[PDB]
Amino acid sequence: ARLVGVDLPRDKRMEIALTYIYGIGRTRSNEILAATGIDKNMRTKDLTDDQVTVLRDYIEGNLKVEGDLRREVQADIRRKIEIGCYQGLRHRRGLPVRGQRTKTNARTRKGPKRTI
Amino acid sequence: MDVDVSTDGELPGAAEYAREKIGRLSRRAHRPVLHARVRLTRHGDPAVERPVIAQANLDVNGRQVRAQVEGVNAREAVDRLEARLRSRLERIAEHWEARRGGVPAEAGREWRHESEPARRPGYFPR
Amino acid sequence: PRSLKKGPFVDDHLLKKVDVQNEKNTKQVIKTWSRRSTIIPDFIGHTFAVHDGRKHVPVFVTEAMVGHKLGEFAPTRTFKGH
Amino acid sequence: AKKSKIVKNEQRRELVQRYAERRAELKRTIRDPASSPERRAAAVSALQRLPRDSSPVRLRNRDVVDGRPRGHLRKFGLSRVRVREMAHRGELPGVRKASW
Amino acid sequence: QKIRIRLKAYDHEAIDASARKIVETVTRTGASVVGPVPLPTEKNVYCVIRSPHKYKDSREHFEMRTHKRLIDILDPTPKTVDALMRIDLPASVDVNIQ
Amino acid sequence: PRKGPAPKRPLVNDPVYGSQLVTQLVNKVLLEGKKSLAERIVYGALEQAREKTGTDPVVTLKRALDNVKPALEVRSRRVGGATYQVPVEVRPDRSTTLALRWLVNFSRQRREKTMVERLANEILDASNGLGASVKRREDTHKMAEANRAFAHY
Amino acid sequence: PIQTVGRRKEAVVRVRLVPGTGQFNLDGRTLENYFPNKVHQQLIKAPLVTVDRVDQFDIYAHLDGGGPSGQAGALRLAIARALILVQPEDRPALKKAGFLTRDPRAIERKKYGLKKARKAPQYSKR
RNA sequence: ACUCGUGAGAGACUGCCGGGGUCAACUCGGAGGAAGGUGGGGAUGACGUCAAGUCAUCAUGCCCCUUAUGUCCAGGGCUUCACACAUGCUACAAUGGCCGGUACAAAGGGCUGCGAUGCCGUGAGGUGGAGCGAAUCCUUUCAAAGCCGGUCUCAGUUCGGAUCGGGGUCUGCAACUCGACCCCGUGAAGUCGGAGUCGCUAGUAAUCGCAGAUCAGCAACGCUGCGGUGAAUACGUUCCCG
């Protein structure tokens, strides 16, 4: 079922299917399912249309997900970069920003290993 | 071959000379070299007649080869270390050409530890 | 970060300095030495010469960097590459 | 270690007993209850005005004679090096080598 | 009213000697006892490195063992009390009177 | 083992089947000391085999063992400073050990979505003589035969 | 009455045997609420099986220390001792079965320099 | 009465029997016994070697500094990163992940310390302070693996948790460089690892949790101990090492 432009998994339990929304993990899905009132164990092929609508308007109401969240994160990172703070140039040169050791580790920020 | 040199104190140019001299030993080794480390140290006491100490360690396909030398300067220590390493690698070869004279030969002439024991019948030859 | 009950932390030296600085609405460069002090909305226009370990680097405050520390804007270690 | 640093540790202790006993503790009691009016009281600022050496956070358990700052034992106030030597000489009552 | 007599010493023979001598004197004064009830031994263990520099793998262990005996009397006649505060004991053993 | 053979551990008979070999099997499938899970897996496999065939599980398990039990195995021997593959006769205990180890491993590499079903299928196919352990016994016997020239030492 | 004890690697079992039925009372819980493992039950009842006195002794037991396996072993030793106290002339049958022997296998003390009792830290020659 | 705690003592000595043995050492088997052949594990490390390590625990000959190489302070650094090596932890999953219920330890620590009941938070935690110098009170009455039930269905996934964004708690004068923990979101590599190489013979390896020292806080996945569950294999010294 198309939910906020997200093609839901074909057969999954409700909360874990909702996890596939970029702004929702497991706790968010659980609490929104409990609050709105849908069953949490029922498969994604059992949704009726009005269920899709109630999920849609609830999510657009008291949550921010998908493109807006991505662009807000990108804008926050860019603003942090442009003010010249430590995390700024840490983001600029692709190095860990939370004080992680860089003598050996931090291949996640460094990407794949290169030989020079 | 790639070598990392861990010197100490003051030894200008010792690292490069040791690198270039040791890297030439790869062809002498009959098996691929997995690691090669060299350390240069100098004795603080001026009373030492040979203050500079050079040590090397090569991982010749799991077989550890090491040597240690003393000299009056970096160049002499590196050269003597190269000589000792060459001698050790010569004694380690273990390929067939290096162990063809030690394999037991003949049938009854000569005995070695691993020589094939003579087959004996049950009854005394008589 | 610092707990909310204690409130933000600012050293008294540059505190009195900025209070006497903004009382006559003129903002000259202030030479400072407490990199641990948070940015307060009273700094919005003042220019700080925050220490680095060797010298003082000018820091011109804005609305964006309020709530941070003067220390984030004086990078200590210098690295250019291998 | 160094005589100056052995002495300076003691000077911190006499500073601590003089200041941290009531001055650097009543301010903490003020800051604990959110009900207590800390913000206008400047108990934070008043306690900043106090010397750093008042704070016990600057103290260091050194060896009581040797001055060794590391490998310290709170039961004896002695370094690991000194405890080993005096226990072997039978100087600490009721201490001996172990087996089990 | 009964009072607790508590012994703590690092040496077994010393605390046993004090316990027997104390029951002897209180029985001399004519008091009812319970006997030197044994209590669990307290063990404090410390591990140290032998060498001053490096050599972490070589360690040395020590303990301090404290032995406890419990003495409880009855019928606290004043003569027993006056005897109790008039007892000389080895410095190793302490007494707790409650 | 330089000073002589070491004594063997006399493991106990199983309570719910009364056979030594099922205990040997549970000890072979044991991992990290989780013995309860190992016995559950083995018992489930035996019950699955009983349900599929309709007879006692111990008899078909023994049939599988005899189907995968090897007799001739090859060890490298250095005689007179030269090494060759020499076929060697296998003692009964070692043959049982090898058979059980092969069964357990080759069941671990099956594709039946659960260890119990994999093990049950492997024992059934070994009983009928189609399992991969039976194959492995075929290859080890083939290698033993192909090197029969070196059997004289 | 009669009372014996069983000990197995930090597990202590006090047993009280009376000639009633085969009811097993382990700290107020039955042999099924306790010890939910068939192997443990067989280990428990083995002395009764070899003595063939199954279901003729009501058993009351006190369990403390160790885990389920140690508790079961100590309990089995406890019933063996209780049986040897009740009917002395069965001592051959229990003893040759080993049920009269306390198992002196305890956790080996951890040693300094080693990660575990015998496990040694990984050593790199290169 | 039974455990238990801690004092004393007994108990393994080839003591006995049978056989090999030079009738000698010693050895094989059996009985008794909790234990049988230095029972298991510790402490204990000969003469010396390697001018091995330590003038940075300490002491010390000689040399050197002494308006400084002494001494006080603030800030920074010891945490820098294109890489290389080494020791570990977490994984790559179904012998598993998640949720609910539920059973069993030992050892140790605690006075300006342990800190309970209760109340407030979702959770770090906050308020509050019962009782404890402690076989008593607190560390929960102590565990986790375990057992039972439900769900997931072989996928880079309900695996894996890195990295990153936001929001907080605590300690501390102060968490920017540079603490730990909590919540929401984010969801990387990783499909069992080449040459080569390491540890371990029984309560051992493997696996699970607990505690202590240092310590205001912690970089602790480290070290030193404690208990829970608990294997496989050893034909035999030709080869490798000492």
From TrEMBL, chain B:
Superkingdom: Bacteria
Name under which the protein is recorded: Sigma 54 modulation/S30EA ribosomal protein C-terminal domain-containing protein
Organism: Mycolicibacterium smegmatis (strain ATCC 700084 / mc(2)155) (Mycobacterium smegmatis)
